């Protein structure tokens, strides 16, 4: 559906948010407004993003407590088009100022959650802000780089770099430990999907002394875990699993990581 506007009505809205990913060549500034069945953004060029409240599967509130940046991130059911391609992922932050920067996150959480709690009184659908559990929080290279992993109550998640990371925590059937070996000073996480015809997720790299407390998480979700030594190929063993589904649980199915 198309989003509806009351223009009689006095809409939360929230200003000076950079969107990510890009619309235009370099980023663009705007204003963030949550209308009667959506949001949309206005950049200051005039573009226009919606966002539907029934498009949204996750959405997620990451303060700047620890972070230079303070980020809304819907983590979208249905891909939408902006920006020429086509998006799961779409975001709006704002940097902490360059002591004029404790009184200034102070003032964006404050502004961030007053908006969030106006929005969740708006919607007639259940949309929550889900806040990362910091505590809980790794550190791993899903891409290029170490970056900041935390948990969510639906989701494991890094929104403050970009390309984003968001995994839904009821879609993972299982977590592989790799290079789990005496001695060595950090492993490698695959996150295997029930759906298999899902390419599987890595967290490279992670240090060796956060792995129980990995596993401990995991075991708070329900998440099965397993570990060995070597790397293994998960392109060709999902398109094994994939080809021929009914043998593969015939022979024992996961048990071979066991």
Known sequence: DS???????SNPKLKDLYIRPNIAQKRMQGSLEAHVNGFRF????????????????????????????????????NAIMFGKKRHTDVQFYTEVGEQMEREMRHKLKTAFKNFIEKVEALTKEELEFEVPFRDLGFNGAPYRSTCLLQPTSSALVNATEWPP???????????????????????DMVIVYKDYSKKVTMINAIPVASLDPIKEWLNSCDLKYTEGVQSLNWTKIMKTIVDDPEGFFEQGGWSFLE
């Open 3 to 9: 989003l509806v506007i009351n223009l009689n009505r």
């Open 42 to 77: 206005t950049s200051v060029r005039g573009d226009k993003v919606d966002i539907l409240y029934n498009n949204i599967k996750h959405a997620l509130f990451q303060p700047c407590d620890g972070e230079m940046i303070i980020v809304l991130h819907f983590h979208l059911k």
């Open 165 to 187: 990371f968001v995994v839904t925590l009821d879609e993972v059937e299982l977590i592989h430990f790799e290079r789990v070996q005496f001695h060595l000073k950090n492993f």
